[PDB]
């Protein structure tokens, strides 16, 4: 059936927007994933777990009689997804199970390791999540060998249909670099944000390069990926080292064996995929990757014996029965055991991305210290596995049951405790009126509490205006949140909250990041009542001061905001049509498009673009809260053009004298070209709208002011 | 952007079930659009369409000084997508303003008219929706244009994105048949469920079939269209003949010189489109089909003079300005207006379609008739246009506003209204103790329910159980209904109602349609009882019966459910894969996919499928309201293979002995096969969900029983 999309294909798409309604949703409105957990015997699921590692089902027979490799191997692929770049992908929300992760190639046999599942889930039911599972399965795997790891936290509530991600533009399935929809231009610079070297790989090709076997090169792809998964160095060499401590790939004979994907295979295959033609199709003749390496001589317990081996031997360049790169320790004896003959025993064995942590330089000492102090790695590993599987949790407040770590991590963006009263009703519409008072305008107001909320990205939870990171670096000198001024706002907002807290009783205070976003409030109520109406903005205190210290600027620099649409604001100019990027951020702040409509037609008339830019700022009352953007976008007295000096700049005249109107950009006049969104704009630029109009802006501006706000879940 | 649509091009498409969500609507959940619409001044609304009539704009200036001609065409291509195969289509969603059909090409210009009514739109706000606000101005434009209409309903609520529809699967517009995707195939047999000749034409090309000028093969399309829009010959005839008194078609140059449609344009188009390089581009130099062609001498009046010209000249076939054929009288004097100049006339010219009006030998003797009684001609086009702008709108009770026509016709499928004292609470309880005492079973209860209640579908508000219609021609004899079966059901339950109603005073009764529910509801129950829960299901009653002489029989054979998954029921083999046809059932029936999934996994044990065939029906406790569907679809102990005889078969055998357990259809194993069917399956089938499961049954189950009670809502 021909669809939209065929016949306009690059037209923007709202369905992003509209996903995770309650309609596709199994559960009730009421159902709450935290208070399901929270009574989980989660000992007992553990116990299962533990006892599932070594009972083999002969539809998958376990490899040395016990799953653990595999179940790692699933749980560091359902977190590996995660790109720094936007927050998404990650093990957050349990996408392994859905179109398209379910069916990459580098996914491959994990549909086996999620089936052996089935029995403890459905066990459990609801009071454990899929996204938890997977995670939860991967600790105890490792336990079950012999390692202790840092902890682990649930709250991943489980999603009813596939997120919408960027992966690629590929049409073919890990396709090498350099063809028509490459990844990659310059000198080897991958796409932002993309995280991975070919489509439907977690990171990187393991037999080099787009399959040239050099442990150098495939260091440097190693090395890119990692840190766009917001791994370092240390980091990284710790996951690979340890996770190859275990189990083994598979690549028993030629891939040509292997049948359809889990999405295109038949549908009595039942959600599983890959059927191999090769001899009994799993087990000894098992083809996952098309690699045939065993790393360890106990591949079923923790041990050093990775980088024995890999220091310890040379290594010569050879095929495994698929015809992959690969390589085998020269002159070694055979001392890594068979999976299932326990009569034979093989040579040891490498990929060429395990060989870069030794021939790249940088990686070779942290593999050398970890070599000599074998507790070194185990801590390393531990808190590198620990991070890889909550990195896109969000903040400490959602982690949930008995074994969460107390120590408080860097990269978690951590919030101190707040240990004092909180400001009541009373003081929130004093503090309200001391802003208004000082003389900052509806427009300084505004501009600041969204530069401090809009952050937040709900891929990976990060960002918000909790903390007052806005004040520290470096968010404090984004050119999106205009320094000078941002600075004067700040300081005087100081002033008043240095007055307000000296003058009160009983250790109650309020925190800057509380009063930034009041302050916001009491603009947008100013706003508000500059139009003629009364309305409460609500507040929700309990926001609290992150220190300087607590804040890694490195990590930050991911949430600056390149591309605001809701300010008008394009750092530099991108092969992505601002339109796009626009409904980009309104999907990383959760809106619909309804949302983004109302929001963004209130903030034009308040003032909130960046450098008082008058494009869109479609009213002759700026500074009062009215849907004129709305009637004055779809007056057809008005006709637009693209200014000669710049295509994505537009002139609105009247259409009879010719008379220079407006200006605007594609951002703007995309709500009166989109027949979407033109139709919500009509709604709010009709004549009796006004009233609603304001309610639902003041709904969504709540609603961005506590995004970050699970101390209040 | 790589999407899942490319990855796997066949894979079911669940979004359909989950679009018109409440992110997507930017009214509140409480919005009540016929409350809202009640309060309208319609009488202003219709004075200011009038005034509209005649108010010329500059960027779209009136032929001949009047829109009505446009109008009347804008509100026709309203209504005339619909289909009566499906019932999607048509005037009732306003869908003319959304992708695609706001940019189909027989849709050209109506852009124009549709903006000439944003003035209107925004001051009357929500209180008119754009659905009402096309069919009302066509309305209006017949009035100014000295034409008295039937009447008039407002209540179309508006939609907020694309409706779902199968338009074709051809991949260029306006394809002639015979392609790689043909509509076409036999002799001339156009594939259900389409209702037009060539992807983006709302009926039949006015050139004549594929182009070729035959007027008689033409009447041949016009024929199975309009048939398919459920407009026999004397309404076909009264409607195109109708329509052509008014107005005129825009060919005044080479289509060459239109450019891109609406979704295609530049966004400094603001939502317009077909802009064009000849001459003016607009008014005198419109192109929109590129035919040439005035009918009457009074385009702005309503006149006979479409049947005059028809009969009183002999026709030659010509080409418009743009090359396209057309008919023009011969010898005859120029006494056509021009749109325009004053000082200009024309001869009278005719599209092959209008000649069909003549030369087809059963049309021919209606448009003598109507020629030769003007008053007759009148009386039908009221009628068909009536009929035509509310076909797709629903039961009477639907029907809003001080227009509404008094006669009630056929073709609403019309309910006797109930005139006696309903049954009350008490009166349920002993109807429900009757129905299991007389030993009908659980299976034959709720399957009668089910057939009954499932032929409601929601893109027209046809069928659904009132009106008692299963027992009447032609749903009583439909194979998917057992019709020996659902006689000894029904008599059972008449033998009730007539002792029931024997006894009792006042004039309290009743209805064979309540009572046919209220047993499916006792069924429910019992299955639940059966099952150790004790569960009321919820009733309704109000339900009245029609009679035969309120039952068109071939318009209700487009109801007939040749698949119907629900029952496991396929009439014969399609090239559709019944799982698709399983989703579009779900769709028409209102059903989320948790709703569809719980439903039939529910149906299946309760023994509701046709034939009481075995396919799905994993359980060992039939008629007992479990969650077995699930928990043993699921098991993993089960391996399922299609079947040698028949690979729409699957049979599920153990994997470790092989012996059979069970079989199933495509439709079954689909909710084990697909990723987002199998994760909803999975929370049903789970330990913990067989309250929740029973529980969520009984809901979809009322809410199928309700889908059509209107004079509830
Ligand atoms: C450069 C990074 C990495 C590459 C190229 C890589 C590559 C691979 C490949 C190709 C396989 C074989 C799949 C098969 O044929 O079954 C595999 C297995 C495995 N990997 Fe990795 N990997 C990397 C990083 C990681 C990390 C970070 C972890 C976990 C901390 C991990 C844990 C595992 C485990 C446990 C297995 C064994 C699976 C089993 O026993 O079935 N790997 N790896
Ligand atoms: C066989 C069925 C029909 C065919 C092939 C057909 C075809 C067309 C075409 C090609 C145009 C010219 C479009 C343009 O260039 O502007 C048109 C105009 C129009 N049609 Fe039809 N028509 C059909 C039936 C109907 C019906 C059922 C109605 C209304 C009851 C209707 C009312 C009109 C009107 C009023 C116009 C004039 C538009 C204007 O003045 O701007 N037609 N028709
Ligand atoms: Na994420
Ligand atoms: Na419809």
């Known amino acids: 059936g021909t669809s939209n999309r065929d016949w306009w294909p690059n037209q923007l798409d709202l369905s992003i927007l509209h996903r995770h309604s309650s309609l596709s949703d199994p559960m009730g409105k009421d159902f709450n994933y935290a208070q399901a957990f929270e009574k989980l015997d989660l000992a007992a699921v553990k116990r299962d777990l533990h006892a599932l590692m070594t009972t083999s089902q002969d539809w998958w027979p376990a490899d040395f009689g016990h799953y653990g490799g595999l179940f790692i191997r699933m749980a560091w692929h359902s977190a590996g997804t995660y790109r720094t770049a936007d927050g998404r992908g990650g093990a957050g929300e349990g996408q392994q199970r859905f179109a398209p992760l379910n069916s990459w190639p580098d996914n491959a046999n994990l549909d086996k390791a999620r089936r052996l599942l089935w029995p403890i889930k459905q066990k459990y039911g609801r009071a454990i999540s899929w996204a938890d599972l997977l995670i939860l399965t991967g600790n105890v795997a490792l336990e079950s060998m012999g390692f202790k790891t840092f902890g682990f936290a649930g709250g991943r509530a489980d999603t009813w249909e596939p997120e919408d991600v960027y992966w690629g533009s590929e049409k073919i399935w890990l396709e090498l670099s350099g063809g028509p929809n490459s990844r990659y231009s310059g000198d080897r610079q991958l796409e932002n944000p993309l995280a991975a070297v070919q489509m439907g790989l977690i990171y990187v090709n393991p037999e080099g390069p787009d399959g040239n076997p050099d442990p150098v090169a495939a260091a440097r792809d190693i090395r890119d990926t990692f840190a766009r998964m917001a791994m370092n160095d240390e980091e990284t060499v710790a996951l690979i080292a340890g996770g190859h401590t275990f189990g083994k790939t598979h690549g028993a004979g030629p891939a040509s064996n292997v049948g359809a994907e889990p999405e295109a295979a038949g549908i009595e295959a039942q959600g599983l995929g890959w059927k191999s033609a090769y001899r009994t199709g799993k087990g000894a003749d098992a083809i996952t990757s098309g690699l045939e390496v065993t790393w360890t001589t106990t591949p079923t317990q923790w041990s050093h014996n990775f980088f024995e081996n890999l220091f310890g031997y040379e290594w010569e360049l050879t095929k495994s029965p698929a015809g992959a790169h690969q390589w085998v320790a020269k002159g070694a004896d055979a001392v890594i055991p068979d ?360 709904a969504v501006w709540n609603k961005v002011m506590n995004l970050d706000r699970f101390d209040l879940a």
Chains 1, 2 share one sequence.
């Open 339 to 698: 999976a299932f003959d326990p009569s034979k025993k093989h040579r040891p064995t490498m990929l060429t991305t395990d060989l870069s942590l030794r021939f790249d330089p940088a990686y070779e000492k942290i593999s050398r210290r970890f070599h000599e102090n074998p507790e070194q790695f185990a801590d390393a590993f531990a808190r590198a596995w620990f991070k890889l599987t909550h990195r896109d949790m969000g903040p400490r407040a959602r982690y949930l049951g008995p074994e969460v770590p107390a120590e408080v991590l860097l990269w978690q963006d951590p919030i101190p405790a707040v240990d004092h009263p909180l400001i009541d009703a009373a003081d929130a519409a004093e503090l309200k009126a001391k802003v208004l008072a000082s003389g900052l305008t509806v427009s300084q107001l505004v501009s600041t509490a969204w530069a401090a909320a809009s952050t937040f990205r709900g891929s990976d939870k990060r960002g918000g205006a909790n903390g007052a990171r806005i004040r520290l670096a470096p968010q404090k000198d984004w050119e999106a949140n205009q320094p000078e001024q941002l600075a004067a706002v700040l300081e005087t907002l100081e002033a008043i909250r240095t007055a307000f807290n000296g003058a009160q009783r009983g250790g109650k205070q309020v925190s800057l990041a509380d009063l930034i976003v009041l302050a916001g409030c009491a603009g947008v109520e100013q706003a508000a009542k500059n139009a003629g109406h009364a309305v409460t903005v609500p507040f929700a205190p309990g926001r609290a001061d992150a220190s300087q210290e607590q804040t890694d600027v490195e990590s930050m620099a991911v949430l600056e905001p390149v591309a605001d649409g809701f300010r008008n604001y394009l750092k530099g100019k991108y092969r992505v049509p601002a339109e796009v990027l626009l409904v980009d951020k309104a999907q990383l702040l959760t809106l619909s498009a309804p949302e983004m409509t109302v929001l963004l037609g209130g903030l034009r008339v308040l003032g909130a673009n960046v450098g008082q830019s008058r494009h869109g700022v479609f009213t002759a009352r700026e500074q009062a809260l009215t849907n004129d953007f709305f009637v004055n976008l779809l007056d057809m007295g008005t006709e637009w053009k693209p200014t000669a000096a710049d295509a994505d700049v537009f002139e609105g005249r009247d259409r009879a004298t010719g008379e220079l109107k407006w200006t605007g950009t594609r951002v703007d006049l995309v709500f009166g070209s989109h027949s979407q969104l033109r139709a919500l704009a009509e709604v709010y630029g009709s004549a009796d709208a006004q009233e609603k109009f304001v309610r639902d802006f003041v």
